[PDB]
Amino acid sequence: GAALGVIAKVGVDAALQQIDDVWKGKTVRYWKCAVENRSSKTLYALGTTQESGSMTTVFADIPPKSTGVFVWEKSRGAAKGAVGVVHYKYGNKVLNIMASIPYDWNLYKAWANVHLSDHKESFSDLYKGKNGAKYPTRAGNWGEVDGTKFFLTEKSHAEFKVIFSG
């Protein structure tokens, strides 16, 4: 499963562990992600909004009771962060997840956010708390928006965990 981007049965912690065997990477800022689908519907992979860098691994649909796994990396050679929004379809709704790992930790902090709405949300609206999104959650803290729980480690080489239940 890990090589396909999606693992059955396991939750976020176990899924994160399986990433290293199937991903290398050579950038100094990244976030590994696990999206645990405890809902009743498949989360269909819908897109990404690249603020800095990209999703560099396979992007899979997540059936109920599976966990999607992937990595977001800064661009090779950039002194920029790993910063992106990942979108899934949930019925006709859109699940938006965001994590932001800076290059310059002297100037910036690390942040995450989640928002289920009718559309793909911009990075800016997820970082500002606009258009219905909440103010973002600082790394190192459990967040919960509309019953979706999430956590981003405060690391250059981070882990972003999302548990979605509908």
Residue numbers in the entry: 3 to 168
Can you quote the paper on this entry?
To unveil the structural insights into lipid preference of HALTs protein as compared to sea anemone actinoporins, we have determined the first crystal structure of actinoporin-like toxin, HALT-1 at 1.43 Å resolution with an acetylated lysine residue K76. The crystal belonged to a space group P212121 with one monomer in the asymmetric unit. The overall structure of rHALT-1 resembles an α-pore-forming toxin (α-PFT) with β sandwich fold consisting of 12 beta strands, two alpha helices, and two 310 helices. The rHALT-1 structure revealed the coordination of all the side chains of aromatic residues including Y90, W107, Y110, W113, F125, Y129, W144, and the P104-[W/Y/F]-D106 motif, which are highly conserved to its counterparts in sea anemones. The crystal structure of rHALT-1 has the residue lysine 76 acetylated to form N6-acetyl-l-lysine that interacted with a water molecule through its carbonyl group. In the lipid-binding region, the HALT-1 contains a shorter α2 helix and a longer α2-β9 loop due to deletion and subsequently an insertion of five amino acid residues in comparison to the sea anemone actinoporins. A comparison between HALT-1 and AfFraC in complex with DHPC revealed that the change of residue Y133AfFraC (a conserved residue among sea anemone actinoporins) to F125HALT-1 (a conserved residue among HALTs) caused the loss of C–H⋯O hydrogen bonds between the side chain oxygen atom of tyrosine and the trimethylammonium methyl group of choline, which was a physical state found in AfFraC-sphingomyelin head group interaction.
Actinoporins are a family of α-pore-forming toxins (α-PFTs) that have been identified in sea anemones. Despite HALTs exhibit haemolytic and cytolytic activities that are similar to actinoporins, HALTs were recently shown to bind to sulfatide (SFT) as the primary target, unlike AfFraC, AeEqt, and ShStn-II that bind predominantly to sphingomyelin. The recombinant HALT-1 was found to exert haemolytic activity, and also capable to cause physical lysis on the majority of human cell lines.
